[PDB]
Design a protein around this ligand. Structure first.
Ligand SMILES: [N]C1=N([C]C(=O)[N]C2=[C][C]=C(F)[C]=[C]2)[C]=[C]S1
Length: 435
């Protein structure tokens, strides 16, 4: 496993003990063999759970989610998938790790796909070893894998809007339910319907994840309404999962705009991870999984794989060489390796637009490749009339850094900057030059 030139996929079923049992054994062996090691966590929540499982082992936590005093003698580093990809992109020196361990290696965010591509390329070159830990590796076709205890699987119509009748089974339940919705806006509507019926609801999404997840431990709740982010190792002490089996898919149209297509079916990997939140306790057989549609390979042509190539084309590997995507997920995009490689100054703009600007990868690339500098926000206002961003069915307006009231009409339209109130508020602040 730990020998150079080897990539191992640790594919034990969900709840089999990959993080709490297998991971500390691997880390202990890596420290014994003097292997400079990196452990990659999908989120800050998982990074905190990993510290608990690794307590007593000398690990340098490169995240503010863990409060530890490092001795300076650790040869194992732990950081989030995004942090690893970010440090590779920035001028900062990243050690050439002998062993690369990725937990929740099924994560399909652009920085996670790019991290897999880089690490797998290093292993292919015979320079390093890697271990990818996931119950659902890329290409998996089984939405119903093994579990610690039997699960009641039921195909049923699941609401995606508020309802007045026809779904008594949803509210008649007396336990705790984790409900996967296709979007933040869809979750808001269902959460309001359940709150009106007397239920205590917590909502989770990528932007509110660390703060709102704490509420699942600190208070009594009846429902957790979440997007696909809870597929990445978040654990709940729940009795039931309700799964719409739907997700939004960012799609690049004619290479000039990004729309959020769907809702459409999730992959089998996503369905298995959603179901995998329950059936984890061998002492409580009969947790329920209610599912509202079929699976499909909706990752083919998904913007995230093209965005992963934009990231990889701008990471130094060796001379003019470029890291390829991890082989089982390479056909998800039709791209030319190196097509997105930027010159030094435009690359710095690209990185700053993502890191400080908080823009999606595709949108950051359009701005940087056009030769626009980070602080120049004229492009947020000079697009075509069809790129007008709407807020409450009326064009969104902002006061520019010059003091002029203008309609938000970006030269490149990426639907992710206005998919919910929180995203549109952050994009308005960016267009106004507030960051
Ligand atoms: N899962 C769930 N539930 C059911 C149960 O647990 N059951 C049992 C136990 C034990 C035994 F021995 C037998 C059975 C409820 C709620 S959640």
């Amino acid at each position: 496993m730990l020998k150079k030139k080897q990539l191992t996929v640790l594919d034990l079923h969900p709840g089999a003990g990959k993080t709490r049992r297998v991971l500390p054994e691997i880390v202990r062996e890596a420290i014994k063999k003097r292997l400079r090691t990196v452990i990659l966590a999908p989120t800050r929540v998982v990074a905190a759970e990993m510290e608990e499982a690794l307590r007593g082992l000398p690990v340098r936590y490169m995240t503010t989610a863990v409060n530890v005093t490092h001795s300076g003698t650790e040869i194992v580093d732990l950081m989030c998938h995004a942090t690893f990809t970010s440090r590779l992109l920035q001028p900062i020196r990243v050690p050439n790790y002998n062993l690369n361990i990725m937990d929740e290696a099924h994560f399909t965010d652009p920085s996670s796909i790019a991290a897999r591509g880089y690490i797998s390329t290093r292993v292919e070159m015979g320079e390093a070893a890697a271990i990818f830990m996931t119950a659902t590796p890329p290409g998996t076709r089984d939405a119903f894998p093994d579990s610690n205890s039997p699960i009641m699987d039921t195909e049923v119509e699941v609401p995606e809007r508020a309802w007045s009748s026809g779904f008594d089974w949803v509210t008649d339940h007396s336990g705790k339910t984790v409900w996967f919705v296709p979007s933040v806006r869809n979750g808001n509507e269902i959460a309001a319907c359940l709150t009106k019926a007397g239920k205590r609801v917590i909502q989770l999404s990528r932007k509110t994840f660390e703060t709102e997840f704490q509420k699942t431990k600190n208070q009594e709740w009846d429902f957790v309404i979440t997007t696909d982010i809870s597929e990445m190792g978040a654990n709940f002490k729940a009795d039931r999962v309700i799964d719409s089996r739907r997700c939004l898919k960012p799609v690049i149209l004619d290479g000039e705009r990004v729309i959020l297509a769907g809702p459409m079916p999730v992959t089998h990997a996503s369905a298995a991870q959603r179901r995998g939140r329950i059936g984890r306790n061998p002492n409580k057989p009969g947790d329920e999984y209610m599912y509202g549609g079929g699976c499909a390979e909706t990752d083919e042509g998904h913007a995230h794989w093209l965005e992963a190539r934009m990231l990889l084309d701008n990471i130094y590997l060796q001379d003019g060489l470029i890291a390829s995507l991890y082989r089982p997920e390479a056909d998800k995009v039709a791209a030319i390796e190196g097509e997105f490689k930027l010159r030094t100054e435009q690359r710095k703009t690209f990185v700053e637009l993502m890191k400080r600007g908080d823009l999606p990868v595709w949108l950051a690339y359009q701005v940087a490749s056009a030769g626009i500098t980070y602080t120049d926000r004229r492009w947020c206002f000079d697009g075509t009339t069809n790129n007008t961003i709407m807020e409450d069915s009326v064009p969104a307006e902002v006061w520019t850094k010059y003091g002029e009231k203008r309609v938000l009409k970006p030269r490149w339209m990426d639907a992710r900057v206005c998919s919910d109130h929180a995203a549109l508020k952050s994009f308005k602040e960016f267009a106004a030059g507030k960051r």
